[PDB]
Amino acid sequence: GPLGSDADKNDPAGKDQQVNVGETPKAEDSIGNLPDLPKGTTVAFETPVDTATPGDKPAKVVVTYPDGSKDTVDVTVKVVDP
Ligand code: NA
């Protein structure tokens, strides 16, 4: 059988973050263990996050490992009016 992928061997953990209206969150701030993922792993939001109004915004972080395998994490970006 084949050697497993990076995704098979890693488990990124989602993290909620809070931002103010208008701010642009970074996908890195929605992952709680990025140091434990392989060097060279990238993280991105699947879709840009809406921060034009307050609310709990669901988002997905796509975690792409150097071998091309991927994990997703479902997270929440909380937008508040300051
Ligand atoms: Na995984």
Author numbering: 225 to 306
Text taken from the publication that reported this structure:
Proteins attached to the surface of group A and group B streptococcal human pathogens that contain tandemly arrayed Rib domains have been associated with invasive infections and proposed as potential vaccine candidates. Together, these 5 structures of homologous Rib domains, and further sequence analyses, show Rib is an example of domain atrophy, a rare event in domain structural evolution involving the loss of core secondary structure elements, and also reveal the remarkable structural malleability of this domain family.
The structure of RibR was determined by experimental phasing and refined at 1.7 Å resolution; the domain fold has a cuboidal structure consisting of a mixed 310/β fold comprising a 4-stranded β-sheet curved around 3 short 310-helices, with N and C termini pointing in opposite directions along the long axis of the anisometric fold. These calculated Dmax values are consistent with our structural models (56 Å, RibR; 98 Å, Rib2R). RibR displays a Porod exponent of 1.8, consistent with a rod-like particle tending toward a “flat disk”-like shape. In the atrophy of the Ig-like RibL, a significant loss of the structure (∼20% compared to RibR/RibS) is involved, but the domains remain thermostable with melting temperatures (Tms) of 78 °C and 88 °C for RibL and RibS, respectively, and 71 °C for RibR. The Rib (RibR) structure revealed that the original Pfam analysis successfully predicted the C-terminal residues of the domain, but the N terminus of the HMM needed to be extended by ∼11 amino acids. This has been adjusted within the Pfam database, which now also includes new families representing the RibL and aRib domain.
